[PDB]
Design a protein around this ligand. Structure first.
Ligand code: OLC
Ligand code: OLC
Ligand code: OLC
Ligand code: OLC
Ligand code: G3P
Length: 200
């Protein structure tokens, strides 16, 4: 079963949290530093910007490659794509190889949305960039850009399987951001500023 095989492969590949991998092989436990997350932001806090951008690239590929196989092999309207993108995001969030504690799924979801539509991923990235340049909170930018990815796919008239994939990935990412959210509502969320400019 090529479809079921590809969903399983998206989940197993997504389970490779490269922030955990690169941090542990660099000698660091990400759960202790920063937000406790295993993604590019916390990897940047823990190991510098070089390793964060690499882990972002890898977690992005985790979602891009299986979703691209799904779109090319079954079509943009196939539910194999829905379950492939969901499998990558869930594999990144609940990794089978790392005790089912992983990240919040933003980079991988960006891979999925890029395989679906590079232009939607472009404008969603522009949303993220605007929010981060404006308010200097990574999480706020990620939440807004996720919701906006759904909004763009909706306004473009993308099929129902893709809109459902986006609704579920988005709800997943927000839920995984709940603690960032209450940190934002409490004034205790990390704000990037000239301290990182000087010492990152
Ligand atoms: C938890 C977050 C929300 C999750 C929301 C959905 C949950 C569904 C659960 C299990 C079935 C999915 C497993 C899919 C297995 C492969 C799918 C497949 O084979 O699709 C081919 C199909 O014939 C094309 O029409
Ligand atoms: C080995 C099997 C691998 C197969 C795939 C394994 C991962 C699927 C597990 C959970 C999906 C999570 C979906 C969201 C969970 C619900 C969150 C929630 O509602 O939390 C409770 C409460 O609301 C708090 O206030
Ligand atoms: C179908 C649903 C899909 C939803 C898709 C949402 C798309 C959001 C777009 C881009 C996020 C990019 C975020 C990462 C950018 C760089 C992160 C990073 O490393 O930042 C740390 C620090 O800023 C370094 O100094
Ligand atoms: C036709 C479609 C109908 C459905 C459309 C749904 C749209 C998404 C709605 C809400 C955001 C999802 C996540 C919201 C946050 C839930 C998790 C949270 O923060 O809960 C507190 C925490 O779990 C501690 O208890
Ligand atoms: O501030 P963090 O460490 O929770 O990161 C939020 C980002 O959306 C994770 O990529």
């Amino acid at each position: 079963g090529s479809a079921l095989f590809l969903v399983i492969f998206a989940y197993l590949l997504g389970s490779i949290t490269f922030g955990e991998v690169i941090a542990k092989l660099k000698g660091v436990d990400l759960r202790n530093v920063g937000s406790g997350n295993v993604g590019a932001t916390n990897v940047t806090r823990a190991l510098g910007k070089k390793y964060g951008v690499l882990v972002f690239f890898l977690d992005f590929l985790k979602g891009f490659i299986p979703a691209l196989i799904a779109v090319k092999s079954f079509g943009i309207d196939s539910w194999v794509l829905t379950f492939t993108g969901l499998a990558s995001v869930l594999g990144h969030m609940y990794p089978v190889f790392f005790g089912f504690k992983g990240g919040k799924g933003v980079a991988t979801a960006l891979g999925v949305v890029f395989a679906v539509s590079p232009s939607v991923a472009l404008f969603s990235f522009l949303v993220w960039l605007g929010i981060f340049l404006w308010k200097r909170y990574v999480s706020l930018a990620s939440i807004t850009a996720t919701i906006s990815a759904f909004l763009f796919l909706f306004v473009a008239g993308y099929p129902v399987n893709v809109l459902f994939m986006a609704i579920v990935i988005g709800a997943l990412i927000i839920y995984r951001h709940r603690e960032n959210i209450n940190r934002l509502l409490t004034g205790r969320e990390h704000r990037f500023g000239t301290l990182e400019v000087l010492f990152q």
